[PDB]
Design an enzyme around this catalytic site. Structure first.
Site, PDB file in Angstrom:
ATOM      1  N   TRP A  41      -9.269   6.195  -0.802  1.00 41.04           N
ATOM      2  CA  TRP A  41      -9.375   6.605  -2.190  1.00 41.04           C
ATOM      3  C   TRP A  41      -8.461   6.377  -3.084  1.00 41.04           C
ATOM      4  CZ3 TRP A  41      -8.372   9.769   2.391  1.00 41.04           C
ATOM      5  CH2 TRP A  41      -7.034  10.221   2.337  1.00 41.04           C
ATOM      6  N   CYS A  70       0.929  -1.225   0.014  1.00 42.17           N
ATOM      7  CA  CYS A  70      -0.070  -0.119   0.114  1.00 42.17           C
ATOM      8  C   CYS A  70       0.894   1.257  -0.165  1.00 42.17           C
ATOM      9  CB  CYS A  70      -1.001   0.043   1.175  1.00 42.17           C
ATOM     10  SG  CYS A  70      -1.982   1.618   1.438  1.00 42.17           S
ATOM     11  N   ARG A  79       0.050   4.831   2.833  1.00 45.79           N
ATOM     12  CA  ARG A  79      -0.024   4.459   4.068  1.00 45.79           C
ATOM     13  C   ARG A  79       0.367   5.652   5.168  1.00 45.79           C
ATOM     14  NH1 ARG A  79       3.955  -0.489   4.912  1.00 45.79           N
ATOM     15  NH2 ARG A  79       4.185  -0.271   2.701  1.00 45.79           N
ATOM     16  N   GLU A 114      -4.579   3.643 -10.891  1.00 48.68           N
ATOM     17  CA  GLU A 114      -5.352   2.363 -10.661  1.00 48.68           C
ATOM     18  C   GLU A 114      -6.540   2.225 -11.690  1.00 48.68           C
ATOM     19  OE1 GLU A 114      -6.265   1.098  -6.396  1.00 48.68           O
ATOM     20  OE2 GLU A 114      -5.897   3.324  -6.055  1.00 48.68           O
TER      21      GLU A 114
HETATM   22  C1  HEM Z   1      -6.346   6.685   1.688  1.00 49.94           C
HETATM   23  C2  HEM Z   1      -6.143   6.289   0.481  1.00 49.94           C
HETATM   24  C3  HEM Z   1      -5.192   5.099   0.205  1.00 49.94           C
HETATM   25  C4  HEM Z   1      -4.496   5.059  -0.993  1.00 49.94           C
HETATM   26  C5  HEM Z   1      -4.358   6.362  -2.063  1.00 49.94           C
HETATM   27  C6  HEM Z   1      -3.962   3.631  -1.451  1.00 49.94           C
HETATM   28  C7  HEM Z   1      -3.198   3.322  -2.328  1.00 49.94           C
HETATM   29  C8  HEM Z   1      -3.100   1.861  -2.544  1.00 49.94           C
HETATM   30  C9  HEM Z   1      -2.824   1.220  -3.892  1.00 49.94           C
HETATM   31  C10 HEM Z   1      -2.600   2.248  -5.279  1.00 49.94           C
HETATM   32  C11 HEM Z   1      -2.687   0.069  -3.923  1.00 49.94           C
HETATM   33  C12 HEM Z   1      -2.548  -0.894  -5.025  1.00 49.94           C
HETATM   34  C13 HEM Z   1      -3.886  -1.548  -5.435  1.00 49.94           C
HETATM   35  C14 HEM Z   1      -3.828  -2.393  -6.613  1.00 49.94           C
HETATM   36  O1  HEM Z   1      -3.056  -2.362  -7.675  1.00 49.94           O
HETATM   37  O2  HEM Z   1      -4.674  -3.076  -6.647  1.00 49.94           O
HETATM   38  C15 HEM Z   1      -2.914  -0.294  -2.414  1.00 49.94           C
HETATM   39  C16 HEM Z   1      -2.864  -1.620  -2.141  1.00 49.94           C
HETATM   40  C17 HEM Z   1      -3.499  -2.052  -0.815  1.00 49.94           C
HETATM   41  N1  HEM Z   1      -3.883  -1.098   0.244  1.00 49.94           N
HETATM   42 FE1  HEM Z   1      -4.083   1.033   0.064  1.00 49.94          FE
HETATM   43  N2  HEM Z   1      -4.596   3.030  -0.228  1.00 49.94           N
HETATM   44  C18 HEM Z   1      -5.394   3.744   0.638  1.00 49.94           C
HETATM   45  C19 HEM Z   1      -6.037   3.292   1.545  1.00 49.94           C
HETATM   46  C20 HEM Z   1      -6.020   1.822   2.278  1.00 49.94           C
HETATM   47  C21 HEM Z   1      -6.720   1.678   3.323  1.00 49.94           C
HETATM   48  C22 HEM Z   1      -7.861   2.471   4.213  1.00 49.94           C
HETATM   49  C23 HEM Z   1      -6.399   0.474   3.539  1.00 49.94           C
HETATM   50  C24 HEM Z   1      -6.933  -0.673   4.883  1.00 49.94           C
HETATM   51  C25 HEM Z   1      -7.489   0.025   6.056  1.00 49.94           C
HETATM   52  C26 HEM Z   1      -5.464  -0.060   2.884  1.00 49.94           C
HETATM   53  C27 HEM Z   1      -4.749  -1.155   2.782  1.00 49.94           C
HETATM   54  C28 HEM Z   1      -3.936  -1.755   1.324  1.00 49.94           C
HETATM   55  C29 HEM Z   1      -3.935  -3.229   1.203  1.00 49.94           C
HETATM   56  C30 HEM Z   1      -3.995  -4.438   2.220  1.00 49.94           C
HETATM   57  C31 HEM Z   1      -3.317  -3.310  -0.350  1.00 49.94           C
HETATM   58  C32 HEM Z   1      -3.129  -4.468  -1.005  1.00 49.94           C
HETATM   59  C33 HEM Z   1      -4.342  -5.179  -1.370  1.00 49.94           C
HETATM   60  C34 HEM Z   1      -3.758  -6.298  -2.415  1.00 49.94           C
HETATM   61  O3  HEM Z   1      -2.709  -7.048  -2.252  1.00 49.94           O
HETATM   62  O4  HEM Z   1      -4.841  -6.300  -3.445  1.00 49.94           O
HETATM   63  N3  HEM Z   1      -5.161   0.992   1.752  1.00 49.94           N
HETATM   64  N4  HEM Z   1      -3.090   0.924  -1.905  1.00 49.94           N
HETATM   65  C1  LIG Z   2      -6.432  -0.703  -2.314  1.00 53.07           C
HETATM   66  N1  LIG Z   2      -6.938   0.043  -3.328  1.00 53.07           N
HETATM   67  C2  LIG Z   2      -8.152  -0.186  -3.978  1.00 53.07           C
HETATM   68  C3  LIG Z   2      -7.808  -1.055  -5.102  1.00 53.07           C
HETATM   69  C4  LIG Z   2      -8.782  -0.547  -6.238  1.00 53.07           C
HETATM   70  C5  LIG Z   2      -8.351  -1.026  -7.656  1.00 53.07           C
HETATM   71  N2  LIG Z   2      -7.138  -1.090  -7.833  1.00 53.07           N
HETATM   72  C6  LIG Z   2      -8.940  -0.473  -8.863  1.00 53.07           C
HETATM   73  O1  LIG Z   2      -8.227   0.313  -9.547  1.00 53.07           O
HETATM   74  O2  LIG Z   2     -10.259  -0.450  -8.946  1.00 53.07           O
HETATM   75  C7  LIG Z   2      -7.018   1.625  -3.026  1.00 53.07           C
HETATM   76  N3  LIG Z   2      -6.999   2.776  -3.368  1.00 53.07           N
HETATM   77  N4  LIG Z   2      -7.478   1.472  -1.353  1.00 53.07           N
HETATM   78  O3  LIG Z   2      -8.641   2.388  -1.112  1.00 53.07           O
END
Ligand code: HEM
Ligand SMILES: CN(CCC[C@H](N)C(=O)O)C(=N)NO
Ligand code: HEM
Ligand SMILES: C[C@H](O)[C@H](O)[C@H]1CNc2nc(N)[nH]c(=O)c2N1
Ligand SMILES: C[C@H](O)[C@H](O)[C@H]1CNc2nc(N)[nH]c(=O)c2N1
Ligand SMILES: CN(CCC[C@H](N)C(=O)O)C(=N)NO
Ligand SMILES: [Zn+2]
Lengths: 407, 411
Positions: free
Chosen positions: A278, A106, A109, A283
């Protein structure tokens, strides 16, 4: 035992010590690196419980205090007696915030400590799950001013009474194979859509049909619900320069809400824990729109831009990609829906890494997932060495429920 | 054991058995992945098994495993090791070895080409002037007036570690960098330290933005000596854009021959510390990294200024826009001047075909995803979507410390 990471753009070297607290296994060995692979009892439970309460009490500066030792005793008492235990609200909130903090894939974070936790452990039915989820959706969406949230359903017990959201995200589009041979809508969801139809959903068979929720409570057979259309904020996609862009008829939804993962806190397993933050612009505009096995729109877009598509070396694919991504960001910003661009998000993540290094001794990060799927090396993360390791509390993958469910 | 990798775009699944032959360490453990870390005098005792492994691999490749020629060669090598503490490779083994080091190079996207490598045997070289002559011939041969041919030149192996052959340059052809008193850099900032050494050694610096560096060559553990590559041998390409006519006025050019000269080639336990090799450019190496890295020529601003993009917010994707235009320019320029170059779409697509063939014929293809995925437009190339397994096979190319850090100066 002490490990260094170097940034090759700035020369800043950080020292990682946090990895020594690493619990789970990576998939790699000294002989083989699996860095790019997507998916690499009572006695088990007490150390897990202990390990967690120890970090919890450490975090509130009360390690080895009376309240600490009493809690370990209380939980010890409860495990020996009931084979499981219950988290205090305080522990649950700490655990969830830390599962996000530890999410090595993520990029977002920096936000980890501002997470609204909705405790849904009192939930018993699928209608109740639907209610909780609509409330999460409306709260998180906040009329476009998005707020991070997680909703936590009851923990696994004997494992035959699992809560699951069968959907992969709360809000996604249906996929339909046609007699034609091609695919209408999102090809990634063809199978799930078929499960919905066979369960009873009347599909309108369009390109952007918001899927219904398929919710499973207490190990029971899952049930269908349409999210009030009025709660699903969607964005029409237009370009600040290309008049024709809107004619493609593209839209996306404002709320990314992963609903298929498992939250592990102090050994306890929360199989239904939908969470949302968000979008980062890439993505949607790189992956959702341009992946060959997704909406795959590059061919159509390049045509309208009248680029020479004869040879790969004209970089027509690359040119269209940038424009599609410009349009996604513009459309979201114009409708006042929170979105972040890959430059801003990765710059934040570097700042977050530095904070984590100086305050915590490190930050597990998966470079393969952290580097954006376009313009990699012009974002600072490309140049940042990262160490990937697994800390708990964590979000984990789990098998898709249709392969697991006994009807 | 069998290991599977999946392509998440095509669902094609491959099975790896080759990884069982891997000996060297990765840096990773069960508890930590070091997959994004850039960088994670042998006894008789250690030398014979290494020679044996290699010769068994060699004799298997020629369908002569266990033959009389195979056995006589093992005994001949065994005898040579006990008598002299080392051994000499036959020409055939050196060629096989050098080709396999490239085949095994997990960070190289260009490996479809591995069996077409011209190997120049420079093991009879004794002096820095000798090395200069060998390297000139390599440059002229590989350049081939723009129709580039892959080549490697192999100088004598390590003996006691006090008599090493080294090319101090990191690539045979590179541009000077100069740190100014006001803290700005003229030329390529990557080459400032090396440029400073050259100057100190007595190079007269022209002090411009694209000065081809002199060769700094060390033979037989002696102090290195400076030589200028004849300019007529250094093919260069002025950079212009197919639609933007002001692009030429940026004053950009690049050289046509990418020639890594600072790596160590290991074959059968033997160490070749000077083994410059060259293929041809993939366009992103120059247009993304060399031009647009913040710590390299850093031209993104000036290009975006000239394009009149909205630069007030990153979310206009102005950097991304400028980046694509620069990369179009590099490919156009090289193509127009008939100098070999490959785009990142073509090169990655060919690599996937190569990789699938290797799985079928060899049992695997070690690949470092972090390096294979291009530095722009990652996921619109097929490699982004391909699971890969990274492991270390010999023969191999290895990093080695920079020679100015280790050399004992004789004066
Ligand atoms: C606040 C805005 C956030 C942004 C901008 C963000 C950004 C991202 C992005 C770009 C990815 C890659 C997604 C993909 O390629 O499928 C990701 C993955 C992930 N995020 Fe975030 N994130 C956010 C919030 C969160 C929150 C609120 C949580 C949990 C409370 C979280 C937990 C995770 C986890 C576990 C992954 C890996 C998911 C997977 O392996 O498919 N993130 N994040
Ligand atoms: C984890 N991720 C959401 C993943 C959504 C997915 N990659 C999509 O582009 O539809 C994210 N931004 N967290 O809220
Ligand atoms: C024939 C055309 C070739 C192409 C298009 C090509 C492509 C590439 C590219 C783009 C890289 C990454 C460079 C970087 O980011 O610095 C690379 C790395 C590498 N290639 Fe090639 N390559 C070619 C030929 C060769 C040859 C002839 C050899 C050796 C015989 C070779 C061995 C290597 C090695 C050892 C690396 C890793 C370099 C490092 O770790 O710094 N390649 N290749
Ligand atoms: C095979 C490879 O691991 C896979 O394509 C990964 C690469 N990096 C990724 N990065 C992110 N953020 N999301 C993804 O789905 C992927 N897919
Ligand atoms: C920290 C990170 O490993 C480093 O920036 C790598 C990433 N991938 C790369 N890939 C290639 N081809 N060349 C490079 O120099 C790098 N740099
Ligand atoms: C290894 N690579 C050359 C590396 C050159 C480097 N990326 C450069 O742009 O100067 C290559 N294409 N081999 O022939
Ligand atoms: Zn690894």
């Amino acid at each position: 035992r002490f490990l260094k990471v170097k940034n090759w753009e700035t020369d800043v070297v950080l020292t990682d010590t946090l990895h020594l607290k690493s619990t789970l296994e990576t998939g790699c060995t000294e002989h083989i690196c699996m860095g790019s692979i997507m998916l690499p009892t009572k006695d088990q439970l007490f150390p897990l419980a202990k390990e967690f309460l120890d970090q919890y009490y450490s975090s509130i500066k009360r390690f080895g205090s009376k309240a600490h030792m009493d809690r370990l005793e209380e939980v010890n008492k409860e495990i020996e007696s009931t084979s499981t235990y219950q988290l205090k609200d305080t522990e649950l909130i700490y655990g969830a915030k830390h599962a996000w903090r530890n999410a090595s894939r993520c990029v977002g974070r920096i936000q980890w400590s501002k997470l609204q936790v909705f405790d849904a452990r009192d939930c018993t039915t699928a209608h109740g799950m639907f209610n909780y989820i609509c409330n999460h959706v409306k709260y998180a969406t906040n009329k476009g001013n998005l707020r991070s949230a997680i909703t936590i359903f009851p923990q696994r017990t004997d494992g035959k009474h699992d809560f699951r959201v069968w959907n992969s995200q709360l809000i996604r589009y249906a996929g339909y194979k046609q007699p034609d041979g091609s695919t209408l809508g999102d090809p990634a969801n063809v199978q799930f859509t078929e499960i919905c139809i066979q369960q009873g959903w009347k599909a309108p068979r369009g390109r952007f049909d918001v899927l219904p929720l398929l919710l499973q409570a207490n190990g029971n057979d899952p049930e269908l619900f349409q999210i009030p259309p009025e709660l699903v904020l969607e964005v029409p996609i237009r370009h600040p320069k290309f008049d024709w862009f809107k004619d493609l008829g593209l839209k996306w939804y404002g709320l990314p809400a992963v609903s298929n993962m498992l939250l592990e806190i102090g050994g306890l397993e929360f199989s239904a824990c939908p969470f949302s933050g968000w979008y980062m612009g890439t993505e949607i505009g790189v992956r959702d729109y341009c992946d060959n096995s997704r909406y795959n729109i590059l061919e159509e877009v390049a045509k309208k831009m009248d680029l020479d598509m004869r040879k790969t070396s004209s970089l027509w694919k690359d040119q269209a990609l940038v424009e599609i991504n410009i349009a996604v960001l513009y459309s979201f910003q114009s409708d006042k829906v929170t979105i972040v661009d890959h430059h801003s998000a990765t710059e934040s993540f570097i700042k977050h890494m530095e904070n984590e290094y100086r305050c915590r001794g490190g930050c597990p990060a998966d470079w393969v997932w952290i580097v954006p799927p376009m313009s990699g090396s012009i974002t600072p993360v490309f140049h940042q060495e990262m160490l990937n390791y697994r800390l708990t509390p964590s979000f984990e993958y789990q098998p898709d429920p249709w392969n697991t469910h006994v009807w």
